[PDB]
Amino acid sequence: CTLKSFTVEKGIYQTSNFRVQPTESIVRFPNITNLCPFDEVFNATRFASVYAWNRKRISNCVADYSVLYNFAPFFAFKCYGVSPTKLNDLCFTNVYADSFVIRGNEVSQIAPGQTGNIADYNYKLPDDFTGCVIAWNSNKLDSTVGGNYNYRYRLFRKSKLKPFERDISTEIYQAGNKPCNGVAGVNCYFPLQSYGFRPTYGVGHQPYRVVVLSFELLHAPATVCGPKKSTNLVKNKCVNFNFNGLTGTGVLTESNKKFLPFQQFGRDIADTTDAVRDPQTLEILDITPCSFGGVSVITPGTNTSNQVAVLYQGVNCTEVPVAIHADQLTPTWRVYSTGSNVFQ
Amino acid sequence: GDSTECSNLLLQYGSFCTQLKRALTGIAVEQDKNTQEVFAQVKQIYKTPPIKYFGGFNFSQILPDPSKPSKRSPIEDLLFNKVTLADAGFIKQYGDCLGDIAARDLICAQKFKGLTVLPPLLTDEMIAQYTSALLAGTITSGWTFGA
Amino acid sequence: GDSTECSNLLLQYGSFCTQLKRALTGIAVEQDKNTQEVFAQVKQIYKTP
Amino acid sequence: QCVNLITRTQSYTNSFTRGVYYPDKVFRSSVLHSTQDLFLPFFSNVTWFHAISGTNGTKRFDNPVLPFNDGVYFASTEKSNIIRGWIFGTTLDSKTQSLLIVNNATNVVIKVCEFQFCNDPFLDVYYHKNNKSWMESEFRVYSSANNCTFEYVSQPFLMDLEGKQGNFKNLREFVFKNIDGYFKIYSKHTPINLGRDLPQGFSALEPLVDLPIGINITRFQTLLALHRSYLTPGDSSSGWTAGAAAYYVGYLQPRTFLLKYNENGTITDAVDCALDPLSETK
Amino acid sequence: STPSALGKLQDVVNHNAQALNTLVKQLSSKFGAISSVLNDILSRLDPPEAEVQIDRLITGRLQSLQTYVTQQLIRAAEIRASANLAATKMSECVLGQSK
Amino acid sequence: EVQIDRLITGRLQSLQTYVTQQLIRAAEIRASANLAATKMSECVLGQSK
Ligand SMILES: *[C@@H]1O[C@H](CO)[C@@H](O)[C@H](O)[C@H]1NC(C)=O
Ligand SMILES: *[C@@H]1O[C@H](CO)[C@@H](O)[C@H](O)[C@H]1NC(C)=O
Ligand SMILES: *[C@@H]1O[C@H](CO)[C@@H](O)[C@H](O)[C@H]1NC(C)=O
């Protein structure tokens, strides 16, 4: 099939790559398990104004997303750097929950790296925002028949706001010698404006609650983790593993590395994870992906014979039992049998 | 790596992988052909006489050393030491032939990144034996062994 | 050009500039080698009588 | 009442190769990894604030509140009986949050609060025979404290040795920086032989704590204690005794650095890039 | 004594080693993608949206591999010219006397 | 940023093609210069049969 012919001449042809497949899947987390304060975010009576966006810190918890499993009528789970359904498979550290109430149609103005008057003078999201935004209608609680003018936004500033920057300085920008004294006119413009939450305005212009969840991924010791079932680990066996969101396959042997107490990930010259600390018991284990290598077929001409030999390049003969050997397939003499005839 | 989705979408791209494999196989067989054309210029292996006296011309430092297991000449040993070594497929039961933990792991990391070095068809011992045959023919036969 | 905004995006693609500059430097030193091998085949300058 | 008690005198010394610390908590071994971080540049100025504490003749203030710039590097040779913490803030008043770090002989307390105090912060301690253990009063030394927001308690950063050699060994290299929402504080304590200032050689500053605040700091100050023999009288010149409360200050700058991790995963060497043409070549 | 005596073969070895090191470092390059670790990308984004990011990574790494293979072909033509010179030198200087 | 990324890719590909063609014609120039050194040795520094 590789040579695209029925007649194969005498030679060695690099046929494929053999990788000893994983045996089982083991998922690990720290033994401690706590209910994350995410519920308190959804149980909050009110959110701060957009000019003074509320910030909460989430850490040292297990991400219990049951709040969005059972009761999630939210209109947009507009995740950007991650998939909404993948949250259970990854752990986060130093999670930041920003929250405010804005107009529904202004979501396009809070896009990652978007530019706008609010995006320049109220709340600038970073151009490389790695997180999610959850917006849901708040007309039930954050709207009044007389007009909910309590929420106010900073309309104007001298300079554009930096990403993830909060400014509460209310100093007026007097462009002339005339003192403002609260008078709107020449060289005097107020930097704040009340929200136009008029009752006559329909949906979109109504208040909606927006929560921006910002995550920094795996470069720091993880503190927020998924609700997955913690299992046991095995040594010298190529298995799947999900260590606090770090997914991989290989063997996990005992490591004699002298990790410093603040260190979690060890890396080799190729800056890939060579060792990891078990989140349950703080001990260092060496990760080594299971054996693999090229597989070439040595054959005479098909005009002459049909028996073939197989070379597994650069692999110890203790990793041979895969589904080509006679011990794993039917005893057919076309290719190879008897178990013996192995040469290192 | 080991992701199936990336391989499937790589299949959608056509056959650059096949062309690259063909080019690298051509490069490897070209390396073997280069070694054969440079060193394997004689059918027979020629043995130096047991008594190595040639009128006073001392070839001890270029002739093979019967003492050391490598059988390389002292000059060959100096050249081997001067140049940085390379993997030679040692049997260490590491799963990837030669390897160690917390050591010179650049080759191990390269292997785990998919880059592999295949051994030459002629081992350094057999390359040294070919060179010894060439030197024996030059010393004993002259230029008449090449025609 | 004379811009750091493009340079920040430029460094994201890795050591491609290192390879290109190394290749060009090798080409230049190879040109020096070419001139030296073609012309500087002697190390004594001879005066015409 | 606010009283200045220090004979602060500014001299200039060489920074050498001090101040090197760990960028992130990622184990690495036998790697010459290069980083781009704020660091104390090699061979820079050091404002050695050589001074004698407990000097009642310095009633008028004579010490400024040093700025923070891009990260203050600190060094000293004083025990917890002399130097007892650090202060950070933008305006150092009750309008902006002030960060106080106190190193008790039994623990360390880190607080973020709108503390109200003058530009002469100190902690007077003495164990009077009435109770054999006298606790300081916040309302006495400090004018006010409102809307406290953060609190942290741990083991002492100053494992001071009673010996004079150990006292000189107390090189509390406490690098303070605020990047990416992290107020990173590092530490070291070298058994190096006694000298006059920061010696030759190298020492990586292991990450002592990574406070999850990382707010900008405009001014930096050193908290000192009035050293006493615990038998001296009270408010008098024969009370708070004179003591050489010398403390050095340096400033960090953005810079590319080439590190060198050893077998044990510790930074054993480092070079600045823009120090001299040899450094850029390296 | 002199470390520069074997400069040519050491340069060949260093060229191969630095080409391999450049290939390895290309893995850390993001090429405009959200990350440079395939497992992290797959665990973060579902295939319908992760397809664009993994395609950008595939294009970047394929460009790196293609440039590596082309420069390997160029330096392999150089090595083949040098090996033809070496074969000619063994024929004319070792297997004979070249004038 | 997207447009600058596109322009960076285009100019980088143009530069990479330029460097590769310089490498190819530099190998050509190096072959010609090795021939020229051989001609200097055997025609100028000697008589070639
Ligand atoms: C002949 O050659 C041997 C070594 O092969 C040497 O020992 C001997 O002295 C030689 N006899 C002569 C030169 O007469
Ligand atoms: C509490 O913190 C706020 C900053 O949000 C500050 O304005 C206020 O003065 C502090 N104290 C009190 C009593 O609110
Ligand atoms: C550093 O590692 C060496 C072995 O590589 C060991 O002998 C030594 O004790 C280690 N140093 C420390 C401080 O652990």
3-state SS string for A280-295: CCCCEEEEECCCEEEE
The angle, 0 to 180 degrees and rounded to 10, between the axes of the packed helices E47-89 and B4-12 is 70
* Inter-chain contacts counted by CB atoms under 8 A, chains B and E: 80
Distances (CA, A) of B64 to B61, B81, B123, C22, E95: 8, 16, 16, 40, 20
Q: Which two tokens stand for residue A224?
A: 């927020």
Query: Residues near ligand 2 with C-beta < 6 Å?
Result: D 146-147
Q: Which of B124, B111, B142, B96 is nearest to B35 (CA)?
A: B124
| C23 contact residues in E (CB cutoff 8 A) | 71
In chain B, the largest separation of any two C-alpha atoms, in whole Å, equals 71
D71 CA to centre of own chain: 12
| D206 contact residues in A (CB cutoff 8 A) | 260, 262
The residues, any chain, with a CB within 8 Å of residue E11's CB and separated by 6 or more, are none
Cβ within 8 Å, pair A90-E44: yes
Nearest Cα residue to atom 13 of ligand 1: B55
Distances (CA, A) of D107 to A24, A232, A316, D101, D141: 47, 38, 56, 11, 20
Beta strands in A59-158 (DSSP E): 61-62, 76-77, 93-103, 131-137, 152-154
Q: Which of D165, D252, D239, D163 is nearest to D205 (CA)?
A: D252
Distances (CA, A) of E30 to B111, C14, E60: 22, 8, 8
The angle, 0 to 180 degrees and rounded to 10, between the axes of the packed helices E7-28 and E47-89 is 170
Give chain E's count of helices (H) and strands (E): 3, 0
CA B97 to centroid of ligand 3, rounded, Å: 28
Q: Does F35 contact chain C (CB < 8 Å)?
A: no
Q: Which of D239, D247, D245, D224 is nearest to D56 (CA)?
A: D239
Which of E24, E28, E46 has its CB closest to that of A86? E46
Question: Is residue A296 within 8 Å of residue A14, measured between CB atoms?
Answer: yes
The residues, any chain, with a CB within 8 Å of residue B34's CB and separated by 6 or more, are E79, E80, E83
Q: Does F24 contact chain E (CB < 8 Å)?
A: yes
The residues, any chain, with a CB within 8 Å of residue D171's CB and separated by 6 or more, are D75, D76, D77, D188, D189, D190, D192, D198, D203
CA A264 to centroid of ligand 3, rounded, Å: 19
Q: Which two tokens stand for residue B74?
A: 């002292």
Q: Which two tokens stand for residue B136?
A: 């024996």
CA-based nearest distance C24→chain E, Å:
13
Note the residue count of chain B. 147
> CA A342, CA B53: separation in Å to the nearest integer?
46
> CA C17, CA C20: separation in Å to the nearest integer?
5
DSSP per-residue letters across C36-47: HHHH-S-SS---
Distances (CA, A) of D151 to D109, D111, D154, D219, F36: 7, 5, 10, 21, 80
The residues, any chain, with a CB within 8 Å of residue A38's CB and separated by 6 or more, are A58, A63, A64, A65, A67, A97
Burial of E76 (0-12, 13-18, 19+ CB in 10 A): buried
- 3-class DSSP state of B75: helix
Distances (CA, A) of D86 to A240, D74, D123, D155, D169: 48, 10, 12, 16, 19
Question: Is residue D39 within 8 Å of residue A277, measured between CB atoms?
Answer: no
Q: Which of A50, A54, A41 is nearest to A151 (CA)?
A: A50
Q: Does A97 contact chain D (CB < 8 Å)?
A: no
Q: Does C19 contact chain E (CB < 8 Å)?
A: yes
Q: Given strand D9-14, what is the order of strands in its sheet?
A: D9-14, D45-50, D247-251, D72-76, D176-179, D182-187, D206-211
> CA E30, CA A91: separation in Å to the nearest integer?
21
- 3-class DSSP state of D224: strand
In chain E, the largest separation of any two C-alpha atoms, in whole Å, equals 71
Beta strands in A222-279 (DSSP E): 224-225, 239-243, 246-254, 265-267, 273-277
Q: Which two tokens stand for residue A295?
A: 């597989």
> CA E84, CA F37: separation in Å to the nearest integer?
17
How would you classify residue B93: left for phi > 0, otherwise alpha for psi between -120 and 50, otherwise beta? Answer: left
> CA C39, CA F40: separation in Å to the nearest integer?
8
Breaks, C-N > 2.5 A, in chain E lie after none
Q: Do chains B and A touch (3 or more CB pairs under 8 A)?
A: yes
If contacts are CB pairs under 8 Å, which of residues 197-226 in chain A contact chain D? 219-221
The residues, any chain, with a CB within 8 Å of residue F24's CB and separated by 6 or more, are E74
Q: Does E70 contact chain F (CB < 8 Å)?
A: yes
Nearest Cα residue to atom 3 of ligand 1: B53
> CA F26, CA F23: separation in Å to the nearest integer?
5
The residues, any chain, with a CB within 8 Å of residue A113's CB and separated by 6 or more, are A125, A126, A127, A128, A129, F1
If one counts every other C-beta atom within 10 angstroms of the C-beta of residue A277, the result is 21
- Going by the DSSP 8-state scheme, the letter that residue F41 receives in this structure is I
> CA A202, CA A200: separation in Å to the nearest integer?
6
- 3-class DSSP state of A341: coil
Amino acid identity for residue D237 in this structure: S
Q: Torsion over CA of D261, D264, D265 and D267, rounded to 10 degrees?
A: -40
> CA D259, CA D270: separation in Å to the nearest integer?
4
Question: How large is the C-alpha radius of gyration of chain D?
Answer: 19
The residues, any chain, with a CB within 8 Å of residue D195's CB and separated by 6 or more, are D168
DSSP per-residue letters across D85-99: EEEEESSSSSSS-EE
Q: Which two tokens stand for residue E90?
A: 């063994």
B20 CA to centre of own chain: 23
The residues, any chain, with a CB within 8 Å of residue A213's CB and separated by 6 or more, are A95, A96, A97, A131, A132, A133, A134
* Inter-chain contacts counted by CB atoms under 8 A, chains C and F: 41
CA-based nearest distance C49→chain E, Å:
31
The sign of the CA dihedral F22, F26, F27, F28 is: positive
- Identify which of D94, D97, D113, D114 to mutate to test ligand 2's pocket (most ligand atoms within 8 A of the CB): D114
Q: Phi and psi of D151, rounded to 5°?
A: -150, 140
Beta strand pairing call for A54-58 and D26-28 = unpaired
> CA A238, CA A249: separation in Å to the nearest integer?
6
Q: Do chains C and D touch (3 or more CB pairs under 8 A)?
A: no
> CA A7, CA A31: separation in Å to the nearest integer?
61
Where is A118: in which H helix or E strand? helix A117-121
What is the residue whose two structure tokens read 């190529």? A238
> CA A11, CA A309: separation in Å to the nearest integer?
11
